[model samples]
Target: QIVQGHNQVIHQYFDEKNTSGVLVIQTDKKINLYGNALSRANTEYVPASTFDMLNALIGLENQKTDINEIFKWKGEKRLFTAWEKDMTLGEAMKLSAVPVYQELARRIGLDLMQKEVKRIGFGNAEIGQQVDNFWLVGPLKVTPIQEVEFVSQLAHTQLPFSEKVQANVKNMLLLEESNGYKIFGKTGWAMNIKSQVGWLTGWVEQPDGKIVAFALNMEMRSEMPASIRNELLMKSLKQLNII
Candidate 1:
């Protein structure tokens, strides 16, 4: 039977917020869905910076970059102040540094980048000609459920990459640990698309070794701040006692 309380908590949150999206949480063998998980969660959207999570892994696996590898900021103006300086890939991940990651894609190159993406079974596995901008603007897309699967693999160290590469990417994804749980997350905003999209995807590891991998995505409306992505996720997660 469906859990009524969990459904209501998630339903009410989305309704009150006046925004529609998807939140998919996979724990152990079960998949608990909130919002339009069957539809929207399966629908593809530009992955935005969320791709950085995988980008970091692929870059490291190819020996193109290191976790601490410095990505020099060219003189080009950056969208965020924190991205204006040279920083390691780990730091770039924290700030969602677009320019830095774009540079990373160039370094990974289209041929290897496309090969790795397909082998990893991410999304529709398409990264067209523009390797640097595909995931950000067009061509590269991943559904919320796809994101969930990707992170789940990373959490379990089941990805094709080496254990060391996965460990380093996981370290880059680490956001915080508290209340007997460790949260690894990444936030993404696709501003260049027709309907801007926002994303927060990762996994939560708790004391008992239970891992909850989740992916939440929403329309980026002016009324709904990007922070809503995580706010909604955290609230839903709390409602389920997954945090």
Candidate 2:
């Protein structure tokens, strides 16, 4: 019955837009409903704030960043976007602040940044012209499958980063009480060339200490409104009884 509902929702979604691909997985089990595992549309999008979470984790582990690290808005006027004037990593994450993350990426440096990205399985990643100065412009191309694989690896702490980095990333994923279960996730959006890419990556923890890592990616001609992307994602989670 649940699976039926999930199919129905997907059918309805596809009816409305060009949903190029979909990948779903559970611990030790998986499913793929798409034309190909790789999409021609799939390319390195900026990764936006999603990489921020990774940058923060790496910084914290190396003692290069502190949770209380203060980041001030570089602009003279407060941008109406989703950033606060000043914040710590925790608060920056809650608000999805871009400046704070941009700074972290720059401080991590190109050599180490490249090493970390490859360590995280984005080996072919290309830094922008400025290289590791800031990932604001370029990120390794990521596919839905790659996104899920990385998240799954993160869930299992299979990366080369120290145990502290893993712990810190996991800890930063705060629980949300929607849908009757604890939900923790980071949302990513980026514009590459003339297209927009959207990502939602995280997992839900079961009572038995099991973790189900999930990643959703959408490529569109125009940016999908955050409200709609989040709404559809949460609805899908509920349909799967994840929440």
Candidate 3:
């Protein structure tokens, strides 16, 4: 299932990813109105979601990293050979390269993984009992408020991480860059078939040098196309006059 590798599956992700109410992380002094500025430790992790963006950031902090370095996709007798090929981090981040990030976490090991995820403070997400597949279906939990906080840190380069790392990850999150300001963020929808929750998280950069970050986990159910999830986010941004 090509959609199975989906960290963001467009309209389908809406049903699951966009179901959660929305919340934003802002560097501009006020949190966006996608949802209330409250953090819930019980936020759920969506299956095949985009936390890999964070994983990529954490993995890059390790010694001797190269974005252009090749990562092979050896079907490895699991799913399909449609994945058997090669990729660089550049390609993987956008591609929602679960396998690539998994390999990165696998090679990077648990010690660094725990230290890095902890440093980022990504909710209750943990490296916990496994490698590679942990964040996907493991004990990780993130609320929209916490996600907004992390995005604010990245956009402002407020994290203790290298400035370049922050900028690099921010660049990869670009959604639009019209006029003078840019919209930087990744769309993440964890399609949890069981929990009936869909999450949408990311932010926008205004031309006036203000940053608005947001996260939403709303009610989701199977059936019907839900592409309006993004539209809802944009509408909320405009409603806040952040754009």
Which candidate comes out best when scored by TM-score?
Answer: 1
Pairs of residues at least 3 apart in sequence or in different chains that clash in candidate 1: none
Q: What is the C-alpha RMSD of each candidate to the true structure, in Å?
A: 2.2, 4.2, 7.6
lDDT of 2 at 25: 43
- Per-residue alpha-carbon lDDT of candidate 3 for residues 1-243, written as tens digits (9 for 90 to 100): 001111122223334343445344354555533342123323545424557767777777774356768987655653334455688876676656677777788877888888878877777757686877776676776666566677677777887777887777777777766767677656554555575555556677777777766665565556626655567666555555667
Q: Provide the lowest-lDDT 10-residue window in model 1.
A: 1-10
The sequence of per-residue lDDT tens digits that candidate 1 reaches over residues 1-243 is 212125766877887778777788878656667863346777889898899988999889988888767888778787777678889999999999888788888989999999999998788889989888888877888888778888998999999999999999898888878988999999988876578887899999999888899888877776666568878888888888888
TM-score of each: 0.94, 0.79, 0.78
**Tens digits of per-residue lDDT for model 2, 7-126:** 656545644655553434445445333222234223445566566667776777777787767887766654446674777888887777766776776777777777777666562466
Better of 1 and 3 by TM-score: 1
What's the lDDT for residue 21 in model 3? 50
Best by lDDT: 1
TM-score of predicted structure 2 = 0.79
The lDDT values for all models are 0.84, 0.61, 0.62
Q: After superposition, how far is residue 1 of candidate 3 from its true place, in Å?
A: 43
Q: Name model 3 segments beyond 4 Å from true.
A: 1-20, 25-27, 32-48, 75-85, 224-226
List, in order, the clash count of every candidate structure. 0, 1, 18
